[PDB]
């Protein structure tokens, strides 16, 4: 027994390529499309709920997840790898930040922590890189709204809007045409729905689409009253119904 | 025996109208022997102020520790740490040594650079936060300081007036404590500027 | 690849056999035991005339009653010497006496097979077998003057005379005919000098060869160059006498 | 305890340390040098627990000499004193603490000013015009408080110390057998071999 | 609270002759004011002509003797059946005792045999390994009663030549095995009279170039 | 116990008594308190019998290892520091030893180092260690000169130990003498205090207070 | 956790990783050392694959291990740092326990031991470095010069060189260095050193650094000029014929 | 066993070269170019952002210039994520030094430490090296303005001007051509931009594709200042130097 | 085939074989011959000692484990030292903790289990030596045969090493005879020497070439070499 794989499984090839990272990126390319758009007063991230069978309950599988009350994430690639990354991300937000400063981490720093976790699966002994790309959206007092992308290599970059996965090339092009620095959240939601429609083959509705936003504080989602400074989470997942109402004005 | 009474020393902080004050004596002794009359007990990281009473060696170690942590914080966050945040950092740093504690009485003072709101806080040696709006006191003459502050203090004092109040509280408390005194320094803090003054006091 | 503790289809440990091949490329070392002591001689074999020959140490003291000569990857012998010296000194601390030559040898040989990447038997942390062979010579009250050949295989043999290194097959054949139960220390010295001369590529002189002996009376001593030079001269004379 | 005194004058730091080593009922030695040169312009005197004293001093010396070779540079007195403070501060919270008090006198060649640091076994550091460890301070700090001046010459400093030593030889219970005095300045460290009657 | 030590009484005696040595010990084992056994051997033949006794806390005495006998066995295994000389056993025993310097074997130990020149030898140890070779040594409960006697009758201390005005010390003529056995038996009958922990039986082990012999004598049982 | 060692023109004198005790009980009058580390190094013992014997014997093994490794005799400074550093590792555990490491090397000349279980290591010309140290110091301090004849030095040393054997209840037995020169130490015999005392009294006229 | 055996025996009795470590040394800049009657000199050549360096701060090829001993090398620069640091630490530890600085042979034996250990320990590769260690034993005036290689083997030399073209410069030294009469002067010693280097450096005033080591911790490095002056006087010895 | 899948990242080739180091360097050669130029009154760091899009938020982006100290900074060429790992340990080493000696860490000591970390991955552990090359720009009171470079092998060297990443050959030649010892920071700024401008594999050199920083001892003060230029500031300096 | 499955002990060949173990077994066959046989009162070991040169000694082949147990080796000597040492300790443990002499049968089980661990894990290698264990315990005389594969068997007599097949056939023939040689050590030995000489070929057993060991009813395990074996040549 005992893990005796203490050497790297990702190494440099004569051409300078890191094979395992390139291959992980290829797995990301085969994944269902997901995207994110940053507005002036919010951020939207969305993807398609590619149910693997009509007998499956697509709601019991969340592709969009809350990391902190003001930060959410979505991905493209290997769903199981994403799931554990979310568990680790939620935990590191506490162990490396909340239990020290008594407040949730700003978006860039949490992204930085996730990125570190992914980089390590690129050099540590006995493991393969995570086969996913993430789109993390959030808000924090001193930086406002932000959107980031994290790749299998651990690299991450901020975006105004972007797409990853299957038809990311076409979707990125469609976003470059409609994006401007004056967009309001509802506008971005609208643009998000339009972009996603080109990537979807079959049914396109609130039950096959998963979408969340980072907007204003939702005092009704807090759970208690009595403390003025505590106004609620900015992260909110739209309901199947909220999505349909917007599809009619498509 | 009592690590908190070996070196002596006091610190006090007060809030005023769009300002804050933090003051301390300058003595550093070894039991009855006065050793140094230049041992300042107030430090600052960016615009956040920290005063520390208790065992001198821990006062020094803690200052170096917080300089170290606030420096990294700034490099990663790309902004100076705020009073409220730093208070939580002190608290968690102290509780981390719950069973082998630093023998100190930290005090935080400053103004949130974004809300302009004056802030102060105190802690016991293992991190419990005392977030009073009026004043925080610490040191070998803490009973005296509580007495002066409760009597002399009043809300919304102007910088120039708060200075007279914090000073009289410090001075008269120090003079009823054998291990406190030997000089004093007062810091008047405003959103834009900070003035440091050395007070004239009894040298016995 | 292939484990460092793998067996060949013939029942031999690859690394140990390949280790023996490295020892064959080393400088020659010869040892001869008599009832008057044991002689140890080596071929310095400097690689350039600018190399100060006396800094070549291939004959070392283990204790007053034990000395030894090496052949092969000589750097590998340091930790072995260190272990031997410690074993001897430690034995004396624990028992107020000299360690027997055979015991000292068995202890050095215990290190030999302690190699591998995780062999189940203890904690053999050493990546490869030693690439050097040793001739351990000494004297103890129970078995008198002795000569042992310690190999990286962990086995050691006692010899009346033995040669190791590049010219061993030739030198050993010579020792087979020259040795006899009544040689004197002087005869042994000349005999070692003679055989070294036959197998060395260079012309043997007091600078490229070195002698040593161990006697019950004075212990282990390394002959200084002047003393050996005379033995060289005395040898040339007896050979030219017929 | 042993006598450890230090004084910073205009262009130098003078260190005075008692020569006796007493164990129980006997004075075993009367020419003990309680000091170690850390670098050409930095000297450290020490007093405290029997074995810990020298072990600590020599340990610090080794580390500074190592830093000097690695960097081919000499750390400033303030840097050295901070290194020494951290070591003592680590020690106070370990299994068995070094019970050693020290005085560090150095001449900072970059600032061209002498400096005197007093650090006790807890890691308590302070920079002073003059200092002392143990009972010595109880008789010398009031003397120096009275006769000290910032612009004193190395010679005036030596007369000031002589005054301190005389007071110690008059009022202290123990016979510390005189002191060894060393001067630290821009030219290094030298020992005043003539203090037995200066 | 738990006390890891106890005291089992007993007394042992070792005397070295010119070409022999003896190690004796009473056979009574006790606890406080009770007798645990009237016959519990305390002196042992450990092989290689060495006799040993570790007196004091019996449990510790047994562990030590057991460990030494095993040491002798391994000495044979690791050094081609070489005989363990008495001086070598002594040093070995020092390391055994000092190994527990911080949780000592609460015993006073004596070993006897012949040195490498055939002479009688006796070695006595401190509970932590301090040792010395001697002519004779009493250990245990009555050691304070016996040693003075042995200093006088074995080494002739304070004894002078009659008529020499205490100017000439009585010569050190050496004792025979028969004369030594007499001193041993007398030492023990005296010890049995004055010390409540001594009695029941006396067992003597004699070591000569021919091996180890044993003699037994009854002692008062009160 | 009383042990002493001093430096002088002819080298070094080393003298020790030979009594071992356990409370008021005299355990032995024939103990060796000087161990011949090696042909050129001497070690004295005071305090715990076992502690001194075990570690000083161990010191010899470490000194021998040095000579095999460095092909040179170990210095008195390096030898004394080996024992000193070892003893320092055990500080607080309860070891008990007061010792003198004495030797003569070409490089250092006659040298004496005092080493105890507190971790103290001191180089010096004169040292007396043990329960009887003060008594030896008394006689030794009032008759010492750097210019004593090997003969007069050996006597002072012997006389000093005698003084201590007489007044210290825990010192006695016999005196063991040693002289240290570059070519090594020279044993100068065992002198039973029983006879030595009377001899010295008569020949010297001292100890006038005892009746004999 | 990583403990793969990287240095092992091959069928012919060689240890390729050690052998290839030597190849890395052959590729390193040349280094030479010659001992005079009262000194030792160490010379090194400076590459020119890229020139626009800041000589003040760029790590020099000769390092002081202690005030009386220096070490130069040929091979991987990064690897040499590891050995230099360990040697420096060992030098201070030795002064601390023996109360005497290390002899040159002792320091050499230590560095060589470290190198050997890295040839038979799991999970590590050998140092791709060979060194020249020179200086004077405490209170001694007899010069010392030793060389160590990847295998861990070491020995002393009257003069020696390692690195690229060391074959060439060694020849120059074998037929230009007389043991009967070693360079009885710091000057004629530095001259023999510069000469041997010119045989391979191909005109490089700024491509040749020298360090002189004398008894009692007297170590100093020459400046471009001081060296440039030696080059000049030597190119004349040639033309004057 | 596992030995079957072990690539052996730390062995020599028959030529005495370290495979993984050579391959990591090959990787570095495809990363955006980074330039460092040291002047009499300051230092300049300039780097080209590899790959960009209209939607890339440049204001909140940093992929090549990082602050290590208040007096030391680095320009990165290679795997960004590998760089962040090393940057963070360097930031720690600097704070440890300040805590120990109460003095800012000398530039070389911090550079040597980071280089030693890199060297380690080269000799033991069986892990791949970091695919990173750094250009360090810093100031200390012993050598003043300094410029260093370190690569995957753990080797480091000092320079007056240097480049890492893509097209260093062409860039080094240009720098060696117009660099002059008596230069001034503003001259350096211009030299840096011109050089990048001629070596870019892109159409034109625009502000959205650059990161700029300087370390000057602003005369009106007496201390050292690090200025990591903002988008607008780069756009400006781009027009002034005549590249519009 | 073989080449692909003989890299380590943790690999089974397509026919269920463990080649590394089989190769270790081969080192035994290359070892010098040794014989073992017992009656109801004694057990005997006879071994042919091999030498390197005519200037070297003949390497010992018999090792004592306790007063009632011992063994002879064939193959890698160092492995025999490791295994005999483990057995010495096990015999030791039994005496110290239970004041009991270790049963030969139990010793065989302990040896089997120790060897097995080295045939199922990565990194290790099988022991490359064969052992013949004899002893006299509470159930009489015993002879065991140990193989590196971990297989231990109790026999009346046997032989291992080169040409061991000769002696083995002779013993399998002499069975009914030697098994009854009770109360007569010299006879059992001669019976063994006759068995071993059935595997000779090169030379003839000499005085510094033969090695004998015996254990029995009132006979502690003792080894006879040289002059002491003269009366049997």
Question: Closest Cα partner for H38 from H175, H233, H211?
Answer: H175
Dist. CA F41–CA F57, nearest whole Å: 12
Domains of chain F (ranges, CATH numbers): 1-212 (3.60.20.10)
Residue with tokens 């102007």: B158
Whether D69 and G91 lie within 8 Å, measured CB to CB: yes
Residue with tokens 């009377």: F198
In sequence order, the 6+-apart residues with CB closer than 8 A to the CB of G108 are G133, G146, G148, G154
Residues of F with CB under 8 A from a CB of C: 57-58, 61, 64-65, 68-69
Resolution value (Å, 1 decimal):
2.4
Dist. CA B123–CA B58, nearest whole Å: 15
Q: Where are the domains of chain H?
A: 1-244
Annotated binding-site members of F: 49
Q: A132 by DSSP, 3-state: which?
A: strand
Whether C94 and E92 lie within 8 Å, measured CB to CB: yes
CA distances from E178 to A52, E53, E214, G157 (A): 105, 22, 14, 74
Q: Which two tokens stand for residue A112?
A: 């930085």
**CATH fold label, D1-198:** 3.60.20
Annotated binding-site members of F for bortezomib: 49
In sequence order, the 6+-apart residues with CB closer than 8 A to the CB of H173 are none
Question: Closest Cα partner for A140 from A96, A97, A106, A91?
Answer: A106
Q: H61 by DSSP, 3-state: which?
A: coil
CB C197 within 8 A of CB C46: no
**Beta strand pairing status for I152-154 and I140-146?**
antiparallel
Task: Give how far B104 is from chain D: nearest CA, Å.
Answer: 14
Dist. CA A82–CA A150, nearest whole Å: 12
Dist. CA B53–CA B173, nearest whole Å: 15
Whether H56 and A116 lie within 8 Å, measured CB to CB: no
Question: Closest Cα partner for H111 from H159, H157, H165?
Answer: H157
Architecture of domain A1-250: 4-Layer Sandwich (3.60)
G124 touches chain A (CB under 8 A): no
Homologous superfamily of E1-222 in CATH?
Aminohydrolase, N-terminal nucleophile (Ntn) domain (3.60.20.10)
Dist. CA E79–CA E67, nearest whole Å: 18
CA dihedral F5, F8, F12, F14 (to 10 degrees): -30
H or E element at residue F83:
helix F76-89
Residues of B with CB under 8 A from a CB of H: 64-65, 67-68, 71-72, 75
Q: Where are the domains of chain A?
A: 1-250
Dist. CA H159–CA H135, nearest whole Å: 10
Dist. CA C184–CA C40, nearest whole Å: 14
DSSP state of A207: T
CB A34 within 8 A of CB A46: yes
Q: Return the number of other C-beta atoms located less than 10 Å from residue A79's C-beta.
A: 16
Dist. CA F26–CA I115, nearest whole Å: 58
H14 touches chain C (CB under 8 A): no
Homologous superfamily of H1-244 in CATH?
Aminohydrolase, N-terminal nucleophile (Ntn) domain (3.60.20.10)
Q: Residues F172, F175, F180, CA angle at the centre, nearest 5°?
A: 145
Write the Ramachandran bin of C85: left for phi over 0, alpha for psi from -120 to 50, otherwise beta. Answer: alpha
Whether C94 and E82 lie within 8 Å, measured CB to CB: no
Task: Give how far G201 is from chain C: nearest CA, Å.
Answer: 22
Residue B122: strand pairing partners? B107, B130
CB G222 within 8 A of CB G209: yes
> From the CB coordinates, do chains I and F have 3 or more pairs under 8 Å?
no
Dist. CA H22–CA A16, nearest whole Å: 8
Dist. CA B18–CA B24, nearest whole Å: 21
Whether G97 and F78 lie within 8 Å, measured CB to CB: yes
Architecture of domain I1-233: 4-Layer Sandwich (3.60)
Q: How many residues does chain A have?
A: 250
Out of F57, F58, F68, name the one closest to residue C85 (CB): F68
Contacting partners of chain F (3+ CB pairs under 8 A): C, D, E, G
**Beta strand pairing status for C29-34 and F184-192?**
unpaired
Q: What are phi and psi of C87, to 5 degrees?
A: -65, -40
Whether F78 and G106 lie within 8 Å, measured CB to CB: no
Contacting partners of chain E (3+ CB pairs under 8 A): C, F, I
F87 touches chain E (CB under 8 A): no
Out of G21, G50, G124, name the one closest to residue H12 (CB): G21
DSSP state of E160: B
Write the Ramachandran bin of E34: left for phi over 0, alpha for psi from -120 to 50, otherwise beta. Answer: beta
The alpha carbon of residue E175 and the mean position of all alpha carbons in its chain are separated, in whole angstroms, by 18
Cα nearest neighbour of H124 on chain A: A7
Dist. CA D130–CA D120, nearest whole Å: 15
Q: Enumerate the H helices of chain D as residue ranges.
A: 52-71, 77-91, 137-147, 154-171
Write the Ramachandran bin of F128: left for phi over 0, alpha for psi from -120 to 50, otherwise beta. Answer: beta
Q: Return the number of other C-beta atoms located less than 10 Å from residue G223's C-beta.
A: 11
Whether H101 and D73 lie within 8 Å, measured CB to CB: no
Q: Which CATH number describes the domain made up of B1-204? A: 3.60.20.10
Dihedral sign for Cα atoms in the order B33, B34, B35, B40? positive
Dist. CA E187–CA E25, nearest whole Å: 11
Dist. CA I221–CA I185, nearest whole Å: 12
Cα nearest neighbour of D64 on chain G: G92
Q: Where are the domains of chain B?
A: 1-204
Cα nearest neighbour of G51 on chain H: H176
> From the CB coordinates, do chains D and G have 3 or more pairs under 8 Å?
yes
Whether I78 and C154 lie within 8 Å, measured CB to CB: yes
Dist. CA G223–CA G230, nearest whole Å: 11
Whether A5 and H2 lie within 8 Å, measured CB to CB: yes
Write the Ramachandran bin of E156: left for phi over 0, alpha for psi from -120 to 50, otherwise beta. Answer: left
CB C131 within 8 A of CB C16: no
Dist. CA I111–CA I83, nearest whole Å: 7
I3 touches chain C (CB under 8 A): no
Residues of A with CB under 8 A from a CB of G: 3-4, 6-7, 125
C117 touches chain H (CB under 8 A): yes
> From the CB coordinates, do chains H and E have 3 or more pairs under 8 Å?
no
CB D56 within 8 A of CB D100: yes
Q: Where are the domains of chain C?
A: 1-242
Cα nearest neighbour of C3 on chain G: G5
Dist. CA E53–CA A237, nearest whole Å: 86
Cα nearest neighbour of F96 on chain E: E101
Residue with tokens 């007489």: F166
Burial class of residue C17 (count of CB atoms within 10 Å of its CB; 0-12, 13-18, 19+):
middle
Q: Using DSSP, how many helices (H) and how many strands (E) does chain C show?
A: 6, 10
DSSP state of F186: E
Task: Give how far A76 is from chain B: nearest CA, Å.
Answer: 28
Catalytic residue among F1, F2, F44, F99: F1
Find chain G residues with C-beta within 8 A of C56's C-beta: 155
Question: Closest Cα partner for A44 from A143, A179, A165?
Answer: A179
Q: What distance, in Å, lies between the first and last C-alpha atoms of chain G?
A: 65
F1 in catalytic set: yes
In sequence order, the 6+-apart residues with CB closer than 8 A to the CB of I142 are I38, I43, I104, I105, I133, I134, I135, I136, I154
Whether E130 and F53 lie within 8 Å, measured CB to CB: yes
Dist. CA B204–CA I78, nearest whole Å: 83
Cβ contacts below 8 Å, chain B against chain D, sum to 34
Q: Where are the domains of chain D?
A: 1-198
Task: Give how far H170 is from chain I: nearest CA, Å.
Answer: 51
Dist. CA H102–CA D81, nearest whole Å: 9
Residue A136: strand pairing partners? A73, A148
Cα nearest neighbour of D120 on chain B: B57
CB C155 within 8 A of CB C13: no
Whether D138 and B39 lie within 8 Å, measured CB to CB: no
Out of D58, D66, D72, name the one closest to residue G89 (CB): D66
Interface test with I, best of E73, E76, E81 (most I CBs within 10 A): E73
H85 touches chain B (CB under 8 A): no
Whether D69 and G67 lie within 8 Å, measured CB to CB: yes
Q: Residues B170, B175, B177, CA angle at the centre, nearest 5°?
A: 100
Q: Which two tokens stand for residue B118?
A: 């004056």
Task: Give how far F208 is from chain D: nearest CA, Å.
Answer: 27
CB A195 within 8 A of CB A35: yes
Question: Closest Cα partner for H197 from H187, H188, H205?
Answer: H205
Task: Give how far H20 is from chain C: nearest CA, Å.
Answer: 19
H222 touches chain I (CB under 8 A): no
> Which approach determined this entry?
X-ray
Q: F96 by DSSP, 3-state: which?
A: coil
| CATH class of the domain whose range is C1-242 | alpha beta
Whether C128 and G174 lie within 8 Å, measured CB to CB: no
Residue A72: strand pairing partners? A66, A137
Q: Which two tokens stand for residue B115?
A: 């809300």
């Amino acid at each position: 027994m005992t893990d005796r794989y203490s050497f790297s499984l990702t190494t440099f090839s004569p051409s300078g390529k890191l094979g395992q990272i390139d291959y992980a990126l290829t797995a990301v390319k085969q994944g269902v499309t997901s995207l994110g758009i940053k507005a002036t007063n919010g951020v939207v991230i969305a993807t398609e709920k590619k149910s693997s069978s009509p007998l499956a309950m697509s709601e019991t599988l969340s592709k969009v997840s809350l990391l902190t009350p003001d930060i959410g994430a979505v991905y493209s690639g290997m769903g199981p790898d994403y799931r554990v990354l979310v568990d680790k991300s939620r935990k590191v937000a506490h162990t490396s930040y909340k239990r020290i400063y008594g407040e949730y981490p700003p978006t860039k720093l949490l992204v930085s922590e996730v990125a570190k976790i992914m980089q390590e699966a690129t050099q540590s002994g006995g493991v393969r890189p995570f086969g996913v790309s993430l789109l993390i959206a959030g808000h924090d007092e001193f930086n406002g709204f932000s959107l980031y992308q994290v790749d299998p290599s651990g690299s991450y970059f901020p975006w105004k809007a972007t797409a990853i996965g299957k038809g990311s090339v076409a979707a990125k092009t469609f976003l470059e045409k409609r994006w401007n620095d004056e967009l309001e959240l509802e506008d971005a939601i609208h643009i998000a729905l339009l972009t996603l429609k080109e990537s979807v083959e079959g049914e396109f509705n609130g039950d096959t689409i998963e979408l969340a936003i980072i907007g204003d504080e939702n005092p009704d989602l807090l759970g208690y009253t009595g403390i003025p400074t505590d106004k609620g989470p900015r992260f909110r997942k739209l309901t199947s119904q909220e999505i349909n109402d917007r599809l009619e004005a498509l | 025996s009592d690590p908190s009474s070996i070196n002596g020393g006091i610190v006090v902080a007060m809030t005023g109208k769009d300002c804050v004050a933090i003051a301390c004596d300058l003595r550093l002794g070894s039991q009855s022997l006065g050793v140094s009359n230049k041992f300042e007990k107030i430090f600052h990281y960016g615009h956040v102020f920290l005063g520390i009473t208790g065992l001198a060696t821990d006062v020094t170690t803690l200052n170096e520790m917080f300089r170290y942590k606030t420096n990294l914080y700034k490099l990663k966050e790309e902004r100076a740490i705020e009073p409220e945040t730093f208070t939580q950092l002190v608290s968690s740093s102290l509780y981390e040594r719950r069973f082998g504690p630093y023998f100190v009485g930290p005090v935080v003072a400053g103004i949130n650079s974004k809300s302009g709101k004056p802030f102060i806080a105190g802690f016991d040696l293992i991190g419990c936060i005392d977030e009073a709006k009026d004043f925080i006191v610490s040191g070998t003459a803490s009973d005296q300081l509580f007495g002066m502050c409760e009597s002399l203090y009043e809300p919304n004092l102007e910088p120039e007036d708060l200075f007279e109040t914090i000073s009289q509280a410090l001075l008269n408390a120090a003079d009823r404590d054998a291990l406190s005194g030997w000089g004093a320094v007062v810091y008047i803090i405003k959103k834009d500027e900070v003035v440091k003054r050395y007070l004239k006091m009894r040298q016995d | 690849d292939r484990g460092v503790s793998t067996f060949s289809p013939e029942g031999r440990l690859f690394q140990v056999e390949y280790s023996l091949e490295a020892i064959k490329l080393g400088s020659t070392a010869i040892g001869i035991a008599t009832k008057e002591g044991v002689v140890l001689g080596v071929e310095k074999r400097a690689t350039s005339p600018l190399l100060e020959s006396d800094s070549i140490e291939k004959i070392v003291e283990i204790d007053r009653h034990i000395g030894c000569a090496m052949s092969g990857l000589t750097a590998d012998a340091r930790s072995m010497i260190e272990h031997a010296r410690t074993a001897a000194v430690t034995h004396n601390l624990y028992y107020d006496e000299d360690i027997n030559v055979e015991s000292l040898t068995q202890s050095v040989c215990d290190l030999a097979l302690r190699f591998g990447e995780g062999a189940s038997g203890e904690e053999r942390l050493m990546s490869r077998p030693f690439g050097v062979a040793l001739l351990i010579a000494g004297h103890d009250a129970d078995d008198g003057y002795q000569l042992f050949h310690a190999e990286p295989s962990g086995t050691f043999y006692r010899y009346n005379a033995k040669a190791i290194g590049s010219g061993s097959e030739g030198a050993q054949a010579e020792l087979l005919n020259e040795w006899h139960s009544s040689l004197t220390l002087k005869e042994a010295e000349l005999l070692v000098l003679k055989i070294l001369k036959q197998v060395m590529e260079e012309k043997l002189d007091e600078n490229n060869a070195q002698l040593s002996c161990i006697t019950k009376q004075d212990g282990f001593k390394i002959y200084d160059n002047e003393k050996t030079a005379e033995l060289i001269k005395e040898l040339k004379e007896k050979e030219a006498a017929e | 305890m042993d006598i450890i005194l230090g004084i910073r004058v205009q262009d130098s730091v003078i260190l005075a340390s008692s020569k006796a080593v007493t164990r129980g009922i006997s004075v075993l030695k009367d020419s003990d040098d309680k000091t170690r040169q850390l670098s050409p312009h930095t000297l450290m005197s020490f007093a405290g627990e029997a074995g810990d004293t020298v072990q600590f001093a020599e340990y610090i010396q080794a580390n500074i000499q190592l830093y000097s070779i690695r960097e081919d540079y000499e750390l400033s007195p303030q840097a050295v004193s901070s290194f020494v403070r951290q070591e003592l501060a680590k020690s106070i919270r370990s299994r068995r603490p070094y019970q050693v008090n020290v005085l560090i006198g150095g001449y900072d060649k970059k600032k061209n000013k002498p400096e005197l640091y007093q650090i006790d076994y807890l890691g308590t550091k302070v920079e002073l015009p003059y200092g002392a460890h143990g009972y010595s301070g109880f008789y010398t700090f009031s003397l120096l408080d009275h006769h000290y001046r910032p612009d004193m010459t190395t010679e005036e400093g030596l007369d000031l110390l002589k005054l301190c030593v005389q007071e110690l030889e008059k009022r202290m219970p123990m016979d510390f057998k005189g002191v060894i005095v060393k001067i630290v300045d821009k030219d290094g460290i030298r020992q005043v071999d003539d203090f037995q009657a200066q | 609270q738990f006390n890891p030590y106890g005291d089992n009484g007993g007394t042992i005696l070792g005397i070295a002759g010119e070409d022999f040595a003896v190690l004796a010990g009473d056979t009574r084992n006790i606890t406080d004011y009770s007798i645990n056994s009237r016959y519990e051997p305390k002196v042992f033949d450990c092989g290689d002509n060495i006799v040993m006794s570790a007196n004091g806390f019996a449990a510790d005495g047994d562990a030590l003797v057991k460990r030494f006998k095993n040491s002798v066995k391994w000495y044979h295994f690791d050094h081609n059946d070489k005989k363990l000389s008495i001086n070598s056993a002594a040093r070995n025993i020092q390391h055994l005792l000092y190994g527990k310097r911080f949780f000592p074997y609460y015993v006073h130990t004596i070993i006897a045999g012949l040195d490498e020149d055939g002479k009688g030898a006796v070695y006595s140890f401190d509970p932590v390994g301090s040792y010395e070779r001697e002519q004779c040594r009493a250990g245990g409960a009555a050691a304070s009663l016996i040693m003075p006697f042995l200093d006088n009758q074995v080494n002739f201390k304070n004894q002078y030549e009659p008529g020499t005005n205490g100017k000439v010390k009585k010569p050190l003529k050496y004792l025979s095995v028969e004369e030594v056995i007499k001193l041993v038996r007398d030492s023990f009958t005296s010890a049995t009279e004055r010390h409540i922990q001594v009695g029941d039986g006396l067992e003597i082990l004699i070591v000569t170039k021919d091996g180890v012999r044993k003699e037994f004598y009854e002692l008062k049982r009160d | 116990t009383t042990t002493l060692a001093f430096r002088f023109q002819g080298g070094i004198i080393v003298a020790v008594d030979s009594r071992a005790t356990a409370g008021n009980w005299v355990a032995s009058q024939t103990v060796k308190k000087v161990i011949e580390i090696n042909p050129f190094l001497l070690g004295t013992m005071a305090g715990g019998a076992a502690d001194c014997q075990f570690w000083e014997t161990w010191l010899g093994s470490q000194c021998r290892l040095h000579e095999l490794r460095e092909k040179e005799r170990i210095s008195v400074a390096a030898a004394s520091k080996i024992l000193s550093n070892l003893v320092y590792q055990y500080k607080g555990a309860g070891l008990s030893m007061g010792t003198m490491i004495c030797g003569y090397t070409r490089k250092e000349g006659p040298t004496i180092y005092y080493v105890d279980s507190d971790g103290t290591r001191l180089k010096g010309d004169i040292f007396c260690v043990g329960s009887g140290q003060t008594f030896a110091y008394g006689v030794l301090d009032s008759n010492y000169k750097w210019d004593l004849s090997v003969e007069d030095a050996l006597y002072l040393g012997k006389r000093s130990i005698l003084a201590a054997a007489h007044r210290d209840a825990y010192s006695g037995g016999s005196v063991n003498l040693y002289h240290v020169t570059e070519d090594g130490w020279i044993y100068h015999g065992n002198h039973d205090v029983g006879e030595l005392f009377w001899k010295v009294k008569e020949e010297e006229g001292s100890f006038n207070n005892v009746i004999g | 956790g990583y403990d793969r055996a990287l240095s092992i025996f091959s069928p012919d009795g060689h240890i390729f990783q050690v052998e290839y470590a030597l190849e890395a040394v052959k590729r390193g800049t040349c280094a030479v050392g010659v001992k005079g009657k009262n000194c030792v000199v160490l010379g090194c050549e400076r590459r020119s694959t890229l020139k626009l360096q800041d000589t003040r701060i760029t790590p020099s090829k000769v390092s002081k291990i202690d005030s009386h001993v220096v070490l130069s090398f040929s091979g991987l620069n990064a690897d040499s740092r590891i050995l230099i640091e360990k040697a420096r630490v060992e030098a201070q530890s030795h002064r601390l326990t023996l109360e005497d600085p290390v002899t040159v042979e002792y320091l050499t034996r230590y560095v060589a031991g470290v190198q050997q250990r890295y040839t038979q320990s799991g999970g590590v590769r050998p140092f791709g470095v060979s060194t020249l260690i020179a200086g004077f034993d405490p209170r001694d005036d007899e010069p010392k010069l030793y060389q160590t290689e990847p295998s861990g083997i070491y020995s002393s030399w009257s003069a020696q060189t390692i690195g690229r073209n060391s074959k060439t410069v060694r020849e120059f030294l074998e037929k230009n260095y007389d043991r009967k009469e070693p360079p009885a002067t710091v000057e004629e010693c530095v001259k023999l050193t510069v000469r041997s280097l010119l045989e391979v450096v191909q005109t490089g005033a700024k491509n040749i650094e020298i360090t002189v080591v004398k008894p009692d911790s007297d170590i100093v490095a020459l400046s471009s000029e001081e060296i440039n002056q030696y080059v000049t006087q030597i190119e004349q010895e040639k033309q004057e014929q | 066993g596992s030995r079957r899948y072990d690539s052996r990242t730390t062995i020599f080739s028959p030529e005495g070269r370290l495979y993984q180091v050579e391959y990591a360097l090959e990787s570095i050669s495809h990363a955006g170019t980074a330039i460092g130029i040291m002047a009499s009154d300051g230092i300049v760091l300039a780097a080209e952002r590899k790959v960009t899009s209209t939607l890339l938020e440049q204001d909140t982006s940093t992929e090549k210039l990082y602050k290590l100290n208040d007096k030391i900074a680095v320009a990165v060429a290679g795997l960004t994520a590998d760089a962040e790992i090393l940057i963070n340990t360097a930031r720690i080493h600097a704070q440890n030094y300040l805590k120990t000696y109460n003095e800012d860490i000398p530039v070389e000591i911090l550079v040597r430490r980071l280089s030693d970390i890199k060297q380690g991955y080269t000799q033991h552990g069986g892990l791949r090296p970091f695919g990173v090359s750094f250009i360090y720009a810093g100031y200390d009171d012993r050598y003043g303005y300094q410029l260093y470079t370190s690569n995957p092998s753990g080797n480091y060297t000092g320079w007056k001007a240097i480049s890492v990443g893509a097209n260093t050959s062409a860039a080094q030649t240009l720098l060696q051509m117009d660099y002059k010892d008596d230069m001034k920071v503003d001259d350096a700024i211009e030299l840096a931009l011109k050089t990048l401008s001629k070596t870019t594999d892109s159409s034109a050199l625009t502000y959205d594709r650059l990161e700029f920083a300087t370390i000057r001892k602003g005369a009106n003060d007496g201390e050292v200042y690090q200025k990591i230029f903002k988008p607008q500031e780069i756009k400006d300096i781009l027009v002034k130097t005549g590249i519009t | 085939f073989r080449n692909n499955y003989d890299g380590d002990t943790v690999t089974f060949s397509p026919t269920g074989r463990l080649f590394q173990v089989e190769y270790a077994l081969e080192a035994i066959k290359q070892g010098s011959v040794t014989v073992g046989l017992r009656s109801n009162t004694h057990a005997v070991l006879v071994a042919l000692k091999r030498n390197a040169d005519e200037l070297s000694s003949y390497q010992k082949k018999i090792i004592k484990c306790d007063e009632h147990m011992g063994l002879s080796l064939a193959g890698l000597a160092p492995d025999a030292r490791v295994l005999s040492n483990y057995l010495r300790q096990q015999c030791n443990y039994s005496s110290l903790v239970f004041n009991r002499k270790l049963a030969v049968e139990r010793a065989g089980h302990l040896l089997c289990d120790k060897a097995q661990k080295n045939t199922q894990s990565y990194g290790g290698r099988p022991y490359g030596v064969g052992l013949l264990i004899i002893g006299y315990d509470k159930s009489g005389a015993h002879l065991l045969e140990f193989q590196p594969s971990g297989n231990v068997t109790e026999l009346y007599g046997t032989a291992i090493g080169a040409r061991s097949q000769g002696a083995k056939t002779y013993l399998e023939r002499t069975l009914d005879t030697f098994i009854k040689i009770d109360g007569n050590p010299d006879e059992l030995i001669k019976a063994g020497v006759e068995a071993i000489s059935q595997s000779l070929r090169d030379e003839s057993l000499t005085v510094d070439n033969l090695s004998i060991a015996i254990v029995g009813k009132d006979t502690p395990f003792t080894i006879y070499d040289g002059e002491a074996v003269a009366k049997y040549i």
